[PDB]
Amino acid sequence: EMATRARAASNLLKALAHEGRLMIMCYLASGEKSVTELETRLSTRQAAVSQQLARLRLEGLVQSRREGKTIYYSLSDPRAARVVQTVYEQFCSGD
Amino acid sequence: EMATRARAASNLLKALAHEGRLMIMCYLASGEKSVTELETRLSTRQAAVSQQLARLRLEGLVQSRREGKTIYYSLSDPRAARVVQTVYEQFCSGD
Ligand SMILES: CN(C)C(=O)NNC(=O)N(C)C
Numbered sequence: 316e317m318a319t320r321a322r323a324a325s326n327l328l329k330a331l332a333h334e335g336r337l338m339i340m341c342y343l344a345s346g347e348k349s350v351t352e353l354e355t356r357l358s359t360r361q362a363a364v365s366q367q368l369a370r371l372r373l374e375g376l377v378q379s380r381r382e383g384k385t386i387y388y389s390l391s392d393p394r395a396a397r398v399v400q401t402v403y404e405q406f407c408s409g410d
Numbered sequence: 411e412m413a414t415r416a417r418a419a420s421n422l423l424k425a426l427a428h429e430g431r432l433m434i435m436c437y438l439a440s441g442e443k444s445v446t447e448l449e450t451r452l453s454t455r456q457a458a459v460s461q462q463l464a465r466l467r468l469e470g471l472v473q474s475r476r477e478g479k480t481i482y483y484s485l486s487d488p489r490a491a492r493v494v495q496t497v498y499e500q501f502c503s504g505d
Pocket residue numbers: 338341402403406407408411412415416419
């Protein structure tokens with residue numbers, strides 16, 4: 316149905332419509348990243364990154380695994396992955 | 411730069427992160443549509459559609475032309491067009 320798929324799409328976009336969460340998703344769009352790598356690449360403060368990761372997890376958009384003492388995040392919803400890949404390609408392209 | 415392109419991307423997503431505006435964009439993603447066609451397809455109330463179209467116009471995402479007494483809207487930002495096409499394809503696909 317058009318309504319329920321429009322609400323799921325709208326909800327993904329609400330999760331992505333935040334500069335910090337979008338940047339996390341863009342970094343994960345190129346492959347799995349440790350938390351250390353994400354924080355190295357992001358200028359966001361650690362407490363903010365932590366909430367943002369939790370929100371992306373709640374929304375079903377990221378998952379994570381432990382390897383030793385490292386936490387690796389990755390994209391988990393393939394619809395969101397493709398949307399973010401399009402955003403990343405389109406908005407990182409110069410004119 | 412990563413910051414200014416991340417803000418433009420984030421702003422597109424904020425404009426898209428609304429069920430009514432997203433549905434308009436999804437309909438325009440398949441080609442130019444008259445206002446009459448858009449309102450026939452949308453269940454949204456006319457005053458709401460009017461504000462939503464105005465917002466999409468302000469954001470640079472849609473443009474329009476007049477042919478006789480008909481107003482035709484179309485997508486105007488190609489980055490947004492591709493993002494919406496990915497949303498439409500991904501979220502209209504069944505499992
Ligand atoms: C648009 N966006 C979030 C993005 O990251 N684009 N990529 C770059 O801007 N560089 C310099 C790699």
